[PDB]
Amino acid sequence: KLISTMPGIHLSPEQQQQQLQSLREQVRTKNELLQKYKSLCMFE
Amino acid sequence: NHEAATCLEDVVYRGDMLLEKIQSALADIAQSQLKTR
């Protein structure tokens, strides 16, 4: 049972949800910025 | 010399516009990267 307390999770599941939502928003905004500069040419 | 002056002015104007655009773009990238933190 101690060896199955080892795994790798320690935060409350609310904190896991907060981390997952924040990281989802991060990947969204970074992909949106990179797509903006994919589409935008400052020159003609 | 007048004609060469206006020609130099035109090329400087095009370069200035392109520089201001790339400068503002780099500033926006820096703002986004600092806001993500």
Partner: peptide, 19 residues
Amino acid sequence: LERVIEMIQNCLASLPDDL
């Protein structure tokens, strides 16, 4: 000016290849 333009272009040519 030309060099800067093509420089910007190839970096833009790099970025959808990351996307």
